Amino acid sequence: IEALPTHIKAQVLAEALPWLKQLHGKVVVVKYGGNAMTDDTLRRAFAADMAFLRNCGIHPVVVHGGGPQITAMLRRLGIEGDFKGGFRVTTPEVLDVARMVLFGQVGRELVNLINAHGPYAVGITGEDAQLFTAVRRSVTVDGVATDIGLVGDVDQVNTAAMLDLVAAGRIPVVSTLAPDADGVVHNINADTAAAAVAEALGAEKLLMLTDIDGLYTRWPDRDSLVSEIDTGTLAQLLPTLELGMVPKVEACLRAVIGGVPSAHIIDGRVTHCVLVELFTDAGTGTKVVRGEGHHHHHH
Amino acid sequence: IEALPTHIKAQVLAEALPWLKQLHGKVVVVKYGGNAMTDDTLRRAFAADMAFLRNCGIHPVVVHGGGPQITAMLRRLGIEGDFKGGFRVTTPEVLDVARMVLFGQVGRELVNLINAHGPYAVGITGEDAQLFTAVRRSVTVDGVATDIGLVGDVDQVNTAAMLDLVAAGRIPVVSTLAPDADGVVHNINADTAAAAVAEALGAEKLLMLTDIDGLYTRWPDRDSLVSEIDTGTLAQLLPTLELGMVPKVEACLRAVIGGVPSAHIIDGRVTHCVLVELFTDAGTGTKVVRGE
Amino acid sequence: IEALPTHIKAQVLAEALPWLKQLHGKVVVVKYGGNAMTDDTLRRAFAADMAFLRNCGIHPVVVHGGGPQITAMLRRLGIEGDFKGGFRVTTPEVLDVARMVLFGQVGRELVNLINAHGPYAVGITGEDAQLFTAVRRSVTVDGVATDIGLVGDVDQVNTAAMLDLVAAGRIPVVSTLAPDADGVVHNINADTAAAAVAEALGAEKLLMLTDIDGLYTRWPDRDSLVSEIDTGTLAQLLPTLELGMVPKVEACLRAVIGGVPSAHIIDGRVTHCVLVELFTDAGTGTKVVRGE
Amino acid sequence: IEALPTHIKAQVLAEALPWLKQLHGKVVVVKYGGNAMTDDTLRRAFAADMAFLRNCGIHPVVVHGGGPQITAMLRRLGIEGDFKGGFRVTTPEVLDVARMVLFGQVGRELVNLINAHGPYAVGITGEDAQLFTAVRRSVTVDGVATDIGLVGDVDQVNTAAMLDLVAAGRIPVVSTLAPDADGVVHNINADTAAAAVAEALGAEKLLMLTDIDGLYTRWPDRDSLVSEIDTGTLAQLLPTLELGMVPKVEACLRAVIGGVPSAHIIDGRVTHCVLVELFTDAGTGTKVVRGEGHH
Amino acid sequence: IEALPTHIKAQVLAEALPWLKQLHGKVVVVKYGGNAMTDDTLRRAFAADMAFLRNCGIHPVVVHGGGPQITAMLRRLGIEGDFKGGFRVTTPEVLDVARMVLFGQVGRELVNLINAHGPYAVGITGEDAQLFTAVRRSVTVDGVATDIGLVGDVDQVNTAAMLDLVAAGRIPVVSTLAPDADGVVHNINADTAAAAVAEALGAEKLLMLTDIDGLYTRWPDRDSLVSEIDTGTLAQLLPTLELGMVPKVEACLRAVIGGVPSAHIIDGRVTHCVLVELFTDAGTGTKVVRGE
Amino acid sequence: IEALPTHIKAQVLAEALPWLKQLHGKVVVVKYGGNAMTDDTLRRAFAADMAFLRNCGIHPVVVHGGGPQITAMLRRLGIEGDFKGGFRVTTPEVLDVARMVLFGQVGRELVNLINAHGPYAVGITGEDAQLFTAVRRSVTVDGVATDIGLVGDVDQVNTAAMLDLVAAGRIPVVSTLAPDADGVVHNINADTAAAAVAEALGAEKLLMLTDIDGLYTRWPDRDSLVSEIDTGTLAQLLPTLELGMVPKVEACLRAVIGGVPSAHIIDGRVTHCVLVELFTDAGTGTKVVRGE
Ligand SMILES: [Mg+2]
Ligand SMILES: [Mg+2]
Ligand code: NI
């Protein structure tokens, strides 16, 4: 805590060098969500960490999400959500509420928390300066022709305009909402979006906070927790996983394969989780790396 | 305009030169509000105008407000107004709704409308990168010691960071919300705020859209609106009209005095009002200039 | 007349946005010539139109020529032309006079007018910093190739250094005279030369002023509104156009086919013809576009 | 021309170092005129020298004049003068001929000569981008007020825009013709103009070619044909000089006092005169240093 | 060591934020010497720390010294020192050996150690590009003693050229040797020199490694040594000290008074001493401030 | 001589224009060594020449060597050398002395000599900022297997970082010593190294000072003295050349066959040899150009 010998405090910082050296001047996309937003002590720690990275010469890019906040508003307002299946179905009136909450509330919280350390955080959506557009998406059953609503995926990204912000020393706080070729705003999956922007900016790393200690090869058995998994194998386990990890996983795959050296799935329930995963050799969380070939499977 | 002789169209476009020359490379703060937001045809025209200025080498900076939208939400949601003689009393919870509507809704509308022409508009508040801080304010009720709530005025502004945006070719869409010293976000008067940022950025002009045709030396007599007035002369007729034109006018004062060559109070009920006031000698409103 | 209602002016200006967005930040080569040089109003207008584009964020590159001025100056000097197959031959003594009238007279004219609006206009020839060279020109009189003096065509262009000028906010006024591969100055044909530099700079539009009112398929005026034709239908129309406008057309054809988006053959006899052509579509001649 | 032992050539070159070092990266205004323009071998040598300076990291700015060429043209056109004091009044038309000759002919010659070595020379007047404006001038004939036409002096200069050209590696060839505050272009004295732009650009030196070997207090043989001089010492010799050397001297005055470390009045009749005056200690010309030395 | 739990490890890091923020983008001059150079584990740790600072956005500037190495060489070479009462006289031959050892040996060691982490370290002296000149120094013994030889103090510094190196991401390793006004190379006191360059570059901090745990108020009192002092108090305890701390002391003075917010005198015998003094609230060493 | 007439002097300076024009803004690698370092008048002239090139807009890059100085030190320090086929076998203890002398002494001399004209010269090795790495090379004694110690060739070069120095107006003085893949510094052949950096920087020329007047093709016959040999033609002489020209010549091949338009082998015993070879059409020294 504080009664720790100085000679040991230095032995901690000193060990981070190999990491500070690997991240310096590099972009790092962090997907904020889960207990990280909920718990006060956790988020306050998250904001402090972003400042840490910023004051080390690292370029953090935060991508956050909503859901509970969005549902809370839709209820508090009284919108009777329609369910064209097993999904919420994002209708126009709903999009307005989603965007309102995500950008005007959730993101605001984060920005102010970060800026408690300096003029760093700046909130933006795909709408602002058209940082990134979206393409309408839909779900299955089997005709797959089910229109879920104004939901979509990140289509294109203006990495140029984005890398300009990190250059000015700002920490962009992204709210997954982007217009399509026609101009209508669409709500995008925070996880997938984070992966998209990660690849586009040529990020050195992609972090994703979750209320889980890692990835499970077969959920029930917690002995199936992998601290590191190679791309080829993950792509083969995808069609046999939990739906809640599919976005997290696909995001990592799209990222690590799109060029992002590695993607991490850490436990956001831990205080200063980002500092631990970046400057400590703790085998906590799941690390994804590009790896194809029978040998990556055989070993 | 098709049956309008070509020799006239030319004169209209030509007569713009003297103005395009005066505004080129200069910053122009425009305060959006009133029918401008309400009417669809008007706002769509407003967005097109901002693109016009942008594609002419001019640097527009939009500052918008709420109020009706904010009240609509506070009601539609359920939040009961716990008032004070004509003031809404922005409680910590009210601020949350205000900021939510202004930034996450009102501003969004504007940004998307502008960006229908290109990657121009970008929404920001005083919160983002601490573009500008605020100082808690209080209005006149009984002796004036009334803390209406989380309301304030623009204290400091990071003109540097702002001039950086206009440099990148972006059109900033500001939502009057800035953190005080301690760091708590407040709600600022769009009109006054627009005036603050105008002066800070060394803007060539400050435009303010209103549902009124001008300034009134004699109200309601109609042939007594000044086409152009000047500082000092305004301060004399300052205490004559009502409270709705006080901030507007007071804003233009703080503006011209703070360095802004001139402030304009045009009628936002007119389609393409900004184009008329900037490239047509026909003053759509009243121009305020530094007078001796 | 000023009776034009304030809402009609707004419509005019507003209707120019789609074009400002298209030309902004781009290069536009204008071939100044014809009565546009002669008439005291038209010419004074052209200078304003260039200043206009310059203050809109556009990049204008004027390319002019002499002709009537040259012959005129030769008459005063008493230099009798040495014709050969209808071609006056450019003897050294003549080249000297062209460089004088073209670069020291007609060019200074434009530069000074344009510069009444600001430090924009700057006159140059291929000789200056070797911005562009010229290749000998050979023409047949009767049976075969013959030398017609010191006449040439635009060959190499330092588009890199050329684009630097417009980037510096300067309006390059070009006098079609370029050095031979061995440094022998030549007189180039403004028309063909304009189309040449237009292509070398990779410019959006090519504006060509002419003392002729229209492109003609015959003149049962109703079928003269070729407001916009395309690059192939004009090719087949080339063996049936007026004798005074074939070069204006061949120039446009070259430019567009080469890589220039659009070519406009407007009637410079119209005050503010440039403006009318760029922000309106109201009949100023033809717009040649990529077609086939 | 050969037979010169290499060990000596090296000595010659090595001696330019102190000078190359003093001029490197600095601006040097050179006033072209006289036999320099007339003689073919001389001008061809002048152009080569400008290229020399350019390829050494020096920033040469050439200012030329006319007169004989201008008069030659006016005669072919029969524009006979309206002299009113030993000089021609610059009627609006005469200006047109002057500008035509200076910019469209005299300057052209120079530019092409220089560019025979590379994309260096670029011709400009005060008209282009308003590099420098002019103020109407009027020389006292019997009283004081006597307009002599569209003649003037360099008023303001856009040193910024000018220093931009030398930055791009260009050698500006200026033709003394500038616009008036009310947009009226006049004809300016090459000598005085050269001095004006020299001071404005903060030039390290100002050279002026003449058909004279130096300055003379009086007009006979040995002694008063000086080599070094300064302010005050010249100001007193001003009213004692024929008009054939008044603007020349004043040019050096307005320049040195203006800031230019030194102004030189060399003999342009010598081949490669500029190379001799800049990289050879034998200064066969009249230099003009700061007025507080030998005061 | 490694058994330390995660959270306790993260906390150590987190507690560094207030410091990384204060040093980011700032220059930090570190005077290397003593056991720091001697002990292998210590220097290897020193080099790692410089890389730490470098990879955090901090700009470290290392200034080292010799003495033992210099004396070692002078002995191997068999150069009997011509002493002057407390001082060896730096004859022209001695300077050559000094410079040879300091730049070609001592500094080399450091550079290679640093660059074991990346293309960071770059060795230079006042000689290179004339980064800084020196003025002959005379240390009078009793009343007077004149020149001890080619010894001097840092006169002028080219902070511009220096700040250029830190800009390129390089970590300059300075060897205290500068040119005379006439170009005569001199040997400068590492401590004083470090202070000179510190002030010149507008360094946020000046660190000085020593084989002592702090600054002594009453030398070998132990127990109550100074934890923090300032310009006035530190300058008043000057005439009551041993020579083995005068330069280390004057340095901190010339620095802090010069503009350096604070100078530190830490114990270089501790592994990673620089990391402890910069990112740990350990009250070791001694902090010298200006005051007010 | 002052006795020489001025009309001649000019002719000399003038005749250099074609050369100044060819070298302006270009890099020129000069290998310093031999009498050039020994003789005082010669080196003082060498330093003046580098300043000449620098003050002409040329970018000189000096690469020097040792050997005699290195051997001189090894002897004074009494370090017995282990030989192999006639090689010193650079052990870790010898390398330290080599680097010490080359960088901390030989190079220092040169730098200070150059900077006697201005803040130009800056000494660096492959160690600094890792400007260039080295690869262990072994010699051949009719059985290549001869690890003659820490000797190697220039492997990679950071032309970027190097071209940055010449950009700042500095004259880099290189001491052939570079890190190994693992950081083990090695001593590199000045001649070959100079050739390596020459090619890497895209140098316009490579000069090499020697105590020989030319390139005597095949053993003593003052008649067989080339003046301008070429690749291939020269290549077929290496196996039949003295050992004192093998590294020089083998270095001139990698230079021109590597990109460098031409390499020159001049006589460094001549005062101002560099000025003669670069601005005098003297046929002294041997030139090497490309030739399939
Ligand atoms: Mg595996
Ligand atoms: Mg049309
Ligand atoms: Ni197996």
From Swiss-Prot, chain D:
Which positions carry the signal peptide feature in this UniProt record?
Answer: none
| Reaction(s) this enzyme catalyzes, per UniProt | N-acetyl-L-glutamate + ATP = N-acetyl-L-glutamyl 5-phosphate + ADP
Site features described as Transition state stabilizer, chain residue numbers? K31, K248
Q: In which pathway does it act?
A: Amino-acid biosynthesis; L-arginine biosynthesis; N(2)-acetyl-L-ornithine from L-glutamate: step 2/4
Query: What molecular functions are annotated in GO for this chain?
Result: acetylglutamate kinase activity; ATP binding
InterPro entries linked to this entry:
AceGlu_kinase-like_sf, AcgluKinase_fam, ArgB, Asp/Glu/Uridylate_kinase, Glu/AcGlu_kinase, NAGK-C
Q: Which residues bind substrate?
A: G66, G67, R88, N187
CDD domains (UniProt xref): AAK_NAGK-C (cd04250)
Origin superkingdom? Bacteria
Compartment(s) where it occurs, according to its Swiss-Prot or TrEMBL record: Cytoplasm
Summarizing the function annotation, the protein's role is: Catalyzes the ATP-dependent phosphorylation of N-acetyl-L-glutamate.
Task: Give the NCBIfam families listed for this entry.
Answer: argB
This protein's name:
Acetylglutamate kinase
Q: Which species is this UniProt entry from? A: Mycobacterium tuberculosis (strain CDC 1551 / Oshkosh)
